[PDB]
DNA sequence: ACACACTCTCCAATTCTCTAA
């Protein structure tokens, strides 16, 4: 329980002049 | 006036409905493996026999969605401990 | 009627191709708004006008060729702007009133020849002009207001639904949004979108924006849309001929068939038959009437006409209908979405969720948010592009806020039930969006990079440790129901399923035992709980479109219901006359070499059940109805 | 005397709501 839960938590520019 | 017939859970519970089906299968015969398909058209055929029976006026799918509505009801219940086991 | 209609001619006059204004049009678009202030709830002056073709006739003139004069440039704008604005927003809702009713159709096919009127390129291609050199400024409000009134004309002219019905078009011809959309290419207003959307300092238009955005895109689903290419034409071409083809095909062979059961003598050549031991409904022995060669196939049901069903009884039904527009559209499209993808997509997200976040008391729609994101993510994901490109949407905060999102329209959709549709549909858009979120999870382990291999084990570490998201699929299943939502949100929902288990699986592979929000996990245990008969009837109701259905839909419920049956060990749960039933067509079916794996399954459980039968005769009992858990595992102990 | 078209009624099936098993 402890061991397998306490690993598994421890993871846890441009301007409109260009365009057009 | 206007007695339209239609099947409720006392017209399913009689004769015609559980006991009737009981007793249809023990004279037919059933071929196994390799005959799956066979056997369920045979068995198919029979039912679709016998729910003309209980209601002759639905179609057989409609019949069974009755039948699926229906079998919620405590009356049947009260046959069905009946029909299994012995009476 | 006649008073508008005489009225409204004060506006000017056509000589040719050169339009002339009166010298008091100014005054006389007045009138018009004053008309508009007083009209009736029943939008009598917006029809008056409508049938007038006021907009038609005199305004695209006026602004086209006199737009100099800004102050009625201006007005004509907001004019249009109010008269064009869709009717579900004038009238608040589509009415139950006939009267009403035909008014909102009468002003809905106004506004459809509004919008094929609008289709002139030199109107897009003025407000796109007029637009640039507002956006120059680096203003004054009615410099801002002029901008808003623009991107919401433009908006108002997309929002109002083609009539398809009316159209009835082939595939790969333009319909009025099509074209439409090919005169905004042809206008370059396309390329202010992307302005928009890829400047900083216009975060208050890029809201507007995403709306324009998701209205032009809605016929075109991304992965089709990225499998286009030049080669398309001889495609399509000899694809046609081999579907012809086996159209053909298909419809002789069903001929044929009936052509042989039917007898070879003519309807009047009479004869009768006794069934000798086949007694009735009475006391006696059937008296068969028909034709000799119909008592190879019988059934005694073939004579009955079907259930007269009550009008409130009738099941949900798709409104709705799967398309493809012309290849040059197709085309324009796909390079739209590649360079929205490259340039405006994580800036235009951050701006929007900043949006929603900040700005509650305007209620804004964040369902277009959810719709872009499993947009763009699936079309980055079809292309198979580097995660970075959609880095923004790559964290925890998305899974928690549609999931509250998706549980508080679930809540809704129970508790509100005036607006229990409404509900389920926004329900159903949250969990296509889910799905995509998966999916790109699942996509990236198979990625060559370990950075982003440990990311994706971060995500789905907190999604399989937290309670939601695997008490979620139980939540829906539970609650499907056949008014509230049509097949197509199960079929998400179970294909969903399938990828939730494949990732959970996965995962518990890492560790001896998975510890989760607190009790040590078991994947048998968690399986166990859809072993309801509920979700069972919901399997089944899918099922029965096999031939319908997807390849993958069909691989995803077959491969789960195995799973069930076999390694949980409820095999008798599926002993249903209904499913026999299937069973029965399914077999009968000459198309069944298309579907190895589910007759087999079927013929493996019909070999466990005449096993049973053999033993047990009450099995044909139990046919008939549905089990609790304790049934199931009690019929193999008798 | 024997067939269509139309109008109208009363009986009881389907669902909402409150309650017990």
């Not at chain 3, 286009?228 to 495609?235: D, E, S, W, Y």
Request: positive net charge; charged residues 25%; hydrophobic residues 40%.
């Amino acid at each position: 329980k402890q061991l397998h839960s306490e690993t598994q938590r421890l993871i846890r520019n441009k301007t409109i002049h260009d365009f057009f | 006036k206007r007695n339209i017939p239609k099947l409720d859970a006392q017209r399913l519970i009689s004769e015609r409905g559980l006991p009737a089906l009981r007793h249809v299968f023990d004279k037919a015969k059933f071929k196994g493996k390799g005959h799956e398909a066979e056997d369920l058209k045979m068995l198919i055929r029979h039912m679709e026999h016998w729910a003309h029976r209980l209601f002759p006026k639905l179609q057989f799918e409609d019949f069974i969605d009755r039948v699926e509505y229906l079998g919620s009801k405590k009356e049947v219940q009260t046959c069905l401990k009946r029909i299994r086991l012995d009476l | 009627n006649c008073e508008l209609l005489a009225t409204c001619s004060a506006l000017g006059y056509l000589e040719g191709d050169t339009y002339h204004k009166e010298p008091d049009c100014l005054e006389s678009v007045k009138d018009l708004i004053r008309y508009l202030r007083h009209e009736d709830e029943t939008r009598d002056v917006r029809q008056q006008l409508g049938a007038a073709q006021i907009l038609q006739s005199d305004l695209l003139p006026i602004l086209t060729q006199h737009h100099q004069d800004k102050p009625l440039f201006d007005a004509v704008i907001r004019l249009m702007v109010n008269l064009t604005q869709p009717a579900l927003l004038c009238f608040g809702n589509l009415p139950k009133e006939p009267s009403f009713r035909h008014h909102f159709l009468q002003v809905l096919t106004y506004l459809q020849a509004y919008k094929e009127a609008f289709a002139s390129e030199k109107a897009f291609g003025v407000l796109s002009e007029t637009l640039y050199e507002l956006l120059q400024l680096g203003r004054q409000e009615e410099d801002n207001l002029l901008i808003e009134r623009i991107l919401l004309l433009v908006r108002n002219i997309l929002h109002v639904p083609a009539d398809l019905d009316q159209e009835k078009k082939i595939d790969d011809d333009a319909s009025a949004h099509d074209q439409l959309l090919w005169a905004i290419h042809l206008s370059g207003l396309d390329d202010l979108l992307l302005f928009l959307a890829s400047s900083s300092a216009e975060e208050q238009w890029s809201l507007h924006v995403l709306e324009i955005v998701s209205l032009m895109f809605r016929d075109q689903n991304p992965e089709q849309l990225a499998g286009v290419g030049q080669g398309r034409l001889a495609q399509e071409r000899s694809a046609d001929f081999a579907e012809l083809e086996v159209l053909r095909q298909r419809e002789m062979a069903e001929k044929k068939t009936r052509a042989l059961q039917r007898g070879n003598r003519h309807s009047r050549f009479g004869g009768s038959y006794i069934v000798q031991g086949l007694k009735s409904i009475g006391e006696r022995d059937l008296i068969f009437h028909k034709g000799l060669h119909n008592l190879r196939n019988y059934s005694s049901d073939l004579g009955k006409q079907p259930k007269k069903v009550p009008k409130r009884r009738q099941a949900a039904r798709e409104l709705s209908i799967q398309r493809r527009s012309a290849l040059n559209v197709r085309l324009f499209l796909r390079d739209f979405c590649s360079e929205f993808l490259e340039n405006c997509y994580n800036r235009l997200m951050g701006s929007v969720k900043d949006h929603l976040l900040r700005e509650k008391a305007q209620q804004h729609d964040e369902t277009y948010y959810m719709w872009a994101l499993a947009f763009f993510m699936a079309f980055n994901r079809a292309a198979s592009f580097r995660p970075g490109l959609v880095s923004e949407t790559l964290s925890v905060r998305t899974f928690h806020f549609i999931e509250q999102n998706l549980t508080n329209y679930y809540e809704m959709m129970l508790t509100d039930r005036k607006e229990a549709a409404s509900w389920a549909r926004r329900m159903h858009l949250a969990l296509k969006a889910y799905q995509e979120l998966l999916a790109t999870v699942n996509e990236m382990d198979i990625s060559p990079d370990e950075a982003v291999r440990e990311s994706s084990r971060i995500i789905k570490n907190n999604i399989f440790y937290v309670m939601e998201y695997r008490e979620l699929f139980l939540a829906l299943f539970r609650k499907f129901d056949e008014r509230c939502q049509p097949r197509s949100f199960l079929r998400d929902l179970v294909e969903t399923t399938h990828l939730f288990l494949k990732m959970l699986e996965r995962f518990c592979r890492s560790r001896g035992n998975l510890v989760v929000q607190e009790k040590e996990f078991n994947f048998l245990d968690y399986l166990k709980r859809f072993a309801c008969s509920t979700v069972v009837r919901a399997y089944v109701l899918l099922l029965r479109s096999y031939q319908q259905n997807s390849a993958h839909t069909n691989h995803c419920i077959v491969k789960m219901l195995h799973r069930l049956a076999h390694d949980l060990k409820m095999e008798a749960l599926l002993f249903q006359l209904s499913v026999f039933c299937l069973f029965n067509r399914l077999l009968s079916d000459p198309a069944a070499g298309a579907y190895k794996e589910l007759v087999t399954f079927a013929k493996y459980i019909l070999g466990k059940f005449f096993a049973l039968a053999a033993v047990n005769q009450k099995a044909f009992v139990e046919l008939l109805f549905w089990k609790n858990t304790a049934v199931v595992r009690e019929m193999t102990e008798g």
